[PDB]
Specification:
two-stranded antiparallel ribbon; LCP crystallization; binds ligand ER0; binds Octadecane; mainly alpha; membrane protein; Four Helix Bundle (Hemerythrin (Met), subunit A); monomer; binds cholesterol; 84% helix; GPCR; 2 strands; Isoprenoid-Chained-Lipid; binds ligand ZMA; Rhopdopsin 7-helix transmembrane proteins
């Protein structure tokens, strides 16, 4: 067989290339949030926590991955730390992505409550807690769910390790039942499915809010035409009562309020006329509503549509991040599933293991590109930093 060092050199070179790009791109994310007060919101606190996890992939996880690829002699608990530390960073990533999804869900479902439910101070506490939980989940093998008690004596003696030491190889020390049931099913797949469910609920909420606006609009316009071609007070009365309901629903910022005050007032004026049986004076009064609609209501309608469209576009941007996370991490998990559940199956070849590892690391490069391409405030701030400071 080809000398192992040849394939190792290609692996190490690619890992270091990923490390540099993971560090530089994610430092730029953090720098941008620092510089630009417009990026300093709770959602971006989770973005920075995720960027920190991706920097730590370049600074620590990749060097650990290079180290463990050599099968060097190590005390089994030191070996476990090096093997498992990336699981902490990946778990931290999952918690940040989950927090972002829920943050955007609260923002679209209860916008008025959002700013007092979701504060900076609560976000900082949630981020600290998520990082502690990530250490506990990812280093669970150090608490005794490990293969340190069943060492590979053949490998130990062939590598010439001293006593207490193992040839530090991931699949020799980390149990595959931990990797498949606990890490993959419980800690990764379940949160990814929850995130899918939350984004689905975001898109369903946006669409139902957009449909309700458009229906309120149409209720207004249709009742305006019912009133015109009407033939008695009871017709005009019914249509006006519908419009009034629709108008109070649409309402649920001074120039905004003035607009709906004019509209509802005009409706109520045309409502009192109708009740007195004055059909033509009611109908005339209702013709006033058209200029109020054109001048105030159509403006609020279009601002509300535009806001919802921006929230959908932002939610799409953030969901793409979750999909690339899944794309980058699932192959390694699926390989572990084959290793674990198919003992009759040939183990995935080494080159495929290392490709899946490298792909998982590439996840720590991509998010800065998604922010630059999809989010104007990031793109513009990256431009300022690159021009001014490079
Ligand atoms: C990647 C680059 C773009 C940026 C990196 C930045 C800097 C700070 C990286 C820091 C790297 C260190 C944290 C790496 C630690 C390396 C350790 C894990 C090596 C362990 C090897 C060891 O213990 O020696 C082997 C023998 O002692 C053993 O066989 C017998 O005990
Ligand atoms: C994020 C996505 C949109 C794009 C990501 C791009 C992905 C596909 C990364 C591209 C890199 C690869 C084309 C090149 C990697 C080749 C590596 C994995 C070869 C490994 C060879 C190998 O087996 O080396 C290790 C062993 O030989 C042994 O020596 C132990 O070190
Ligand atoms: C501030 C940052 C850079 C600190 C980084 C500290 C890291 C590199 C330290 C902390 C714990 C250390 C490990 C502790 C125990 C062992 C077992 C020994 O048999 C081989 C070395 C090994 C595997 C060490 C490698 C280096 C290590 C992982
Ligand atoms: C998430 C997207 C990108 C899909 C990726 C699916 C990947 C992980 C799938 C596609 C085909 C799969 C391989 C098909 C056949 C075998 C041979 C078996 O003896 C070991 C596992 C192995 C080598 C599988 C491992 C996982 C595999 C490489
Ligand atoms: C993508 C997300 C949503 C779903 C994850 C699907 C995973 C868990 C599925 C996809 C393909 C599946 C594998 C397909 C084939 C085999 C070979 C069989 O002898 C043991 C089970 C095993 C190894 C399956 C395990 C579970 C598996 C890896
Ligand atoms: N199975 C596995 N192996 C490794 N590295 C060892 C690759 C290998 C596998 C077998 C072998 O004989 C020599 C090397 N890193 C790994 N990282 C992960 C991982 C992280 C998150 C999910 O899976 N799984 N995983
Ligand atoms: C991109 C900067 C330079 C790239 C590094 C060159 C890679 C050569 C290092 C080889 C060291 C091999 C150590 C033992 C590996 C054997 C694993 C089975
Ligand atoms: C907001 C700042 C980030 C806070 C990070 C602090 C994390 C400290 C380490 C966590 C301790 C948990 C220990 C559980 C694992 C023990 C296994 C030996
Ligand atoms: C298994 C689900 C994975 C699906 C991937 C979703 C991503 C869609 C990509 C379209 C938008 C990408 C924007 C910029 C791409 C830059 C990539 C480096
Ligand atoms: C071997 C290092 C892998 C780095 C791959 C990361 C891909 C990032 C996407 C960049 C696309 C840039 C397109 C510009 C037009
Ligand atoms: C401020 C962080 C600097 C870290 C420098 C440490 C480099 C580690 C090199 C390990 C060499 C191991 C030799 C084994 C015989
Ligand atoms: C920053 C204050 C410390 C956070 C306390 C975390 C609460 C942990 C409760 C249950 C731990 C379950 C860990 C799973 C192994
Ligand atoms: C054989 C070495 C195992 C060392 C474990 C000692 C530390 C206890 C773990 C407490 C974790 C609490 C974190 C909060 C969830
Ligand atoms: C998202 C679906 C998750 C369910 C996957 C469970 C697969 C279990 C495979 C059992 C294989 C047992 C092999 C015995 C011969
Ligand atoms: C990085 C995930 C996609 C990898 C696509 C490669 C598919 C080839 C799999 C064949 C491996 C068969 C070897 C078993 C003997
Ligand atoms: C309000 C913006 C502050 C930016 C926080 C920067 C955190 C960087 C920590 C990275 C840790 C990697 C070793
Ligand atoms: C703007 C407040 C967010 C602070 C997030 C910083 C996270 C740093 C954790 C570093 C742990 C790396 C090992
Ligand atoms: C006594 C030799 C093996 C013990 C492993 C210690 C690993 C955990 C300590 C690292 C500290 C984290 C910063
Ligand atoms: C600058 C970062 C380089 C990565 C550190 C390499 C550590 C390999 C140690 C080999 C174990 C014997
Ligand atoms: C370390 C400061 C940031 C420098 C930015 C240079 C370009 C970053 C490229 C993103 C992969
Ligand atoms: C576990 C991650 C959930 C974080 C939720 C986001 C903010 C909620 C504060 C009330
Ligand atoms: C593999 C399931 C998670 C995918 C989430 C992507 C959201 C569009
Ligand atoms: C339904 C799970 C039982 C199969 C266990 C497979 C472990 C090799
Ligand atoms: C990048 C592809 C890896 C090499 C495939 C076959 C090596 C035996
Ligand atoms: C210059 C870094 C070399 C990688 C370790 C063999
Ligand atoms: Na990450």
């Amino acid at each position: 067989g080809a000398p192992p060092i040849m394939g190792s050199s290609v692996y190490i070179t690619v890992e270091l290339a990923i490390a540099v790009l993971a560090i530089l791109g994610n430092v730029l994310v953090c720098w941008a949030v620092w510089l630009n007060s417009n990026l300093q919101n709770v959602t971006n606190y989770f973005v920075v926590s995720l960027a920190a996890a991706d920097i730590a992939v370049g600074v620590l996880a990749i060097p650990f991955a290079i180290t463990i690829s050599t099968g060097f002699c190590a005390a089994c608990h030191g070996c476990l730390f090096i093997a498992c530390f990336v699981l902490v960073l990946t778990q931290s990533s999952i918690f940040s992505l989950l927090a972002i999804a829920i943050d955007r869900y609260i923002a679209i479902r209860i916008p008025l409550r959002y700013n007092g439910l979701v504060t900076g101070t609560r976000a900082k506490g949630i981020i600290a807690i998520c990082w502690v939980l990530s250490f506990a989940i990812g280093l669970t093998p150090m608490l005794g769910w490990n293969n340190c008690g069943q060492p590979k004596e053949g490998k130990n003696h062939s590598q010439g390790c001293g006593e207490g030491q193992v040839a530090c190889l991931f699949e020799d020390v980390v149990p595959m039942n931990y990797m498949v049931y606990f890490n993959f099913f419980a800690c990764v797949l379940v949160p990814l499915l929850l995130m899918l469910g939350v984004y689905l609920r975001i898109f369903l909420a946006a669409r139902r809010q957009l449909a309700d606006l458009e229906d309120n609009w149409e209720t207004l316009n249709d009742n305006l035409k019912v009133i015109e071609k009407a033939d008695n007070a009871a017709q005009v009365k019914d249509a006006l009562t519908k419009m009034r309901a629709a108008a109070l629903d649409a309402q649920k910022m001074k120039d905004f309020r003035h607009g709906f005050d004019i509209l509802v007032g005009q409706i109520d004026d045309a409502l009192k006329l109708a009740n007195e049986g004055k059909v033509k004076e009611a109908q005339a009064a209702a013709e006033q509503l058209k200029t109020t609609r054109n001048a105030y209501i159509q403006k609020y309608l279009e601002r509300a549509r535009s806001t919802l469209q921006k929230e959908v576009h932002a939610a799409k941007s953030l969901a793409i991040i979750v999909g690339l996370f899944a794309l980058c991490w699932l192959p390694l998990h699926i390989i572990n599933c084959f290793t674990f559940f198919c003992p009759d199956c040939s183990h995935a070849p080494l080159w495929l293991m290392y490709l899946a590892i490298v792909l998982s690391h590439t996840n720590s490069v991509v998010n800065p590109f998604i922010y630059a391409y999809r989010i104007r405030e990031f793109r513009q701030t990256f431009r300022k930093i690159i021009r001014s400071h490079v």
